[PDB]
Structure formats: C-alpha cells, structure tokens
C-alpha cells in the first residue's frame, strides 16, 4: 500500500474468495519481524479459512514487539489488540524511507487515552477530547483534558527504535462454515501415454 493507517485507526481489509501462498512474504524477507501464532510460518499454504483479515498500521520500531497475542502495552491495550487464541501472522518492516519526513511525518497517530482497554480487533477512532481530571472539558484541550491521540515524531534522524515500521497482521478465521481463502496448491505437468 502507498500509505498505511495510524495505529489508533488501523485499517482492516477483509479477504475472501481468493488464493495466496504465505511463503511468498517469507521468501521476499523484506521484514524485520515475521512471527505466526496457531499456524506455522513454514509454507502453510495448504490451509483454508472462512475469512482472512489483513490489518495494517504504522508504529515505532520499539513498539513492533507489542503486536502479538499475550502482549500488553500502549498499543496492545489501547490501539490494537490480538486475542489469546489468535491464529495469524504478524509481519513488520522498516518503512523509514516511506513514512519519515523532514521535520517529522506527523500524519501517523496513536491513542494515549481511553477510559477502558480495547477488545481483540476493536477499532475506535473517536476524536472526542478525553477527560483525565474531575472537571468537564467541554471540547477544550487543557490541563487534565487531552485530545485522545498524539502524533509520532517520525524524523529523518531517528534511531531505529523511533523509525516507523509498517505492520500487517493476518488473522486467519477458521469457522464451521465453507472456507473461501486457500493457498495455490502446487500442480505438475500433465503426462500422457505412461503409467501415472
């Protein structure tokens, strides 16, 4: 994708009625992170799912480690959560030459405030000002009132932990229902006039 969503407003593409081989991503090896849960990454192109959800967003390098089942942290709890029984793959790569700008690429936002934690795969993109204190905000930013999101300082001089990374998470939904997303199971040449 030309552009990825902010982690607070991560995109979700529902994938159905199609075919692809997961090992392609593996083999290209453009990633710094490539970890699967539930399903092995080792060419598991023989599995079919009802749906596949490809979630995507941009975060800092030091945040990549939070995108996983069993994790806690500012993203894992308030921007993007994965379930304990998640089946899926987390792929991430350094996007410093795409998502960084001179002066800082502040087009990417993350949530700092919420009154509760997110559910697995919950997306909440509300811009209503958060009340941290006891008095009402009445739409005004101030001490004890925070517009819930903040931008990332994605500067050209950032060290690796502060460089932007593109994260794509593939959730594999297996239901007692007809499957629609499978891999391109390998075929061979037709051979005629011989025992086959």
């Amino acid at each position, epitope marked *: 994708a030309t552009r990825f969503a902010s982690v607070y407003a991560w995109n979700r593409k529902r994938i159905s009625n199609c075919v692809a081989d997961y090992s392609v991503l593996y083999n290209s090896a453009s990633f710094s992170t490539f970890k699967c849960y539930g399903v092995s990454p080792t060419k598991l192109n023989d599995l079919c799912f009802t749906n596949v959800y490809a979630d995507s967003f941009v975060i800092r390098g*030091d945040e990549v480690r939070q995108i996983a089942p069993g994790q*806690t*942290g*500012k993203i894992a709890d*308030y921007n993007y959560k994965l379930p304990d029984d998640f089946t899926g793959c987390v792929i991430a790569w350094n996007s410093n030459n795409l998502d960084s700008k001179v002066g800082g690429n502040y087009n990417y936002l993350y949530r*700092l405030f919420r009154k509760s934690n997110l559910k697995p795969f919950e997306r909440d993109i509300s811009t209503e000002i958060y009340q*941290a204190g006891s008095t009402p905000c009445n739409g005004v930013e*101030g*001490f*004890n009132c925070y517009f819930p999101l903040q931008s990332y300082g994605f500067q050209p001089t950032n060290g690796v932990g502060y460089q932007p990374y593109r994260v794509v998470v593939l959730s594999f939904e297996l239901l007692h229902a007809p499957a629609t997303v499978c891999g391109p199971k390998k075929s061979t040449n037709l051979v005629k006039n011989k025992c086959v």
Partner: antibody
Amino acid sequence: EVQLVESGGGLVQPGGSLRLSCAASGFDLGGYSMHWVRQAPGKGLEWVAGIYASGGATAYADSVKGRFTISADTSKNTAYLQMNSLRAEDTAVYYCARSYYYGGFGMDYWGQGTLVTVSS
Amino acid sequence: DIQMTQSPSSLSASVGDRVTITCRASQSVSSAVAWYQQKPGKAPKLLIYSASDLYSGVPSRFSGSRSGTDFTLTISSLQPEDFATYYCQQSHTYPITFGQGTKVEIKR
C-alpha cells in the same frame, strides 16, 4: 542537545520573595509545558507548578497555590517561578523540567536545580 | 489529586541481579507515569516515560510494564552505575505527585 538551566535561588527572609528562572535551549517552548519540581533535602520530588507555553494556561499544586505564580516566554525560550511570601516550609531544591503538551507526558529534560532557603 | 505509593523504600540486589520496584497509583493514571533515576547532588534523570517508553540515552537494561494501576520498574541486570534512588511521577492529572523513592543496594 537540550539543556535547561536554573537560577534565582538563594536565601530569603520569611515573607519575602525569590524569582526562579530556567533558560532553555535545543527545543522551542511552544507545544510544551514548563514545570517546576521541588525537593526538600532528605525528601522525594513534588510538583510545584506548570504552564503551557503556547497557551499561557497554568496549573499549581495546592501546597504552593496563591504564593507561587508560573510564567513563560516563547520569544526568549525561558521560564520563571515567582515565589512570594516564602515560608520555612518552602526550603527545597527547585528544578525546572519539561514535558510535551499540557500534561499526560513525563519529563524529558531536567536542569540541575538551585537551592532556595528561607531563614530568619 | 492521584497519589502515588512506592514500594519498597529500599531494595537490595547485587551486581548482575534483577530489580523490580512497584509504583501504585491511587486512581487510574492511564499511561502517563514516569520513572526517574537520582544520584546524590544531581537532578533526576528520566529513564522511562508514559509507563513503557524507554528514554533515549538510557541503557537498554531499563524496562517496565503495567497491570491496572501498578507500574513495575525493572532493571534487567544491575551494574554499579545503577545504584540510585528511583522515583515515579504521575503526569496524568494535576497536581503532579510522586512516589517516595526506592533506594537500591547491593545485598552485602
């Protein structure tokens, strides 16, 4: 490189005043809140006051409310604490520190502080 | 007016040993709590901000995590330069309060 430098401490008589000043460099003040933090010898840290540099809005700890006023100047890239009617209870090392936005953020840079004492 | 309780007042762990200090907010502090390191005669240095963000210039040995209102301050392995009094600050709301300070010693 970001630096914060305190001045304006020293000995005052009770009921008198001292004006702390924090020079700053390496960043602007706008978009940040400037804060003063107090620490009595042998004690932990206490927030005293804060100002949002781009708004002029302030917040104060109850413990110094009324007696202290906080201000900042974005053209000068400096900030001040005006401490009036100083009490024996206000003897402490004062530090300037900064955090991003009005609040909700920790303090990245700290100066080394100055000692403020009150004694008859 | 969210108060912070820090425990223990002192902790011992020898060089190479792991340190965990717990900071408890009396109310939700969101993810606006910061961890500072103080040496005698010096201003507190920021180690970790907004609960889990390691501050640039701070050794990778420093880390931390959250459960509810409990903020765990962790040093994966102590070196002689890490024996300091550690403090938590709650920037979520005003006034800003701090914990009491935990002194780390060497298990002599």
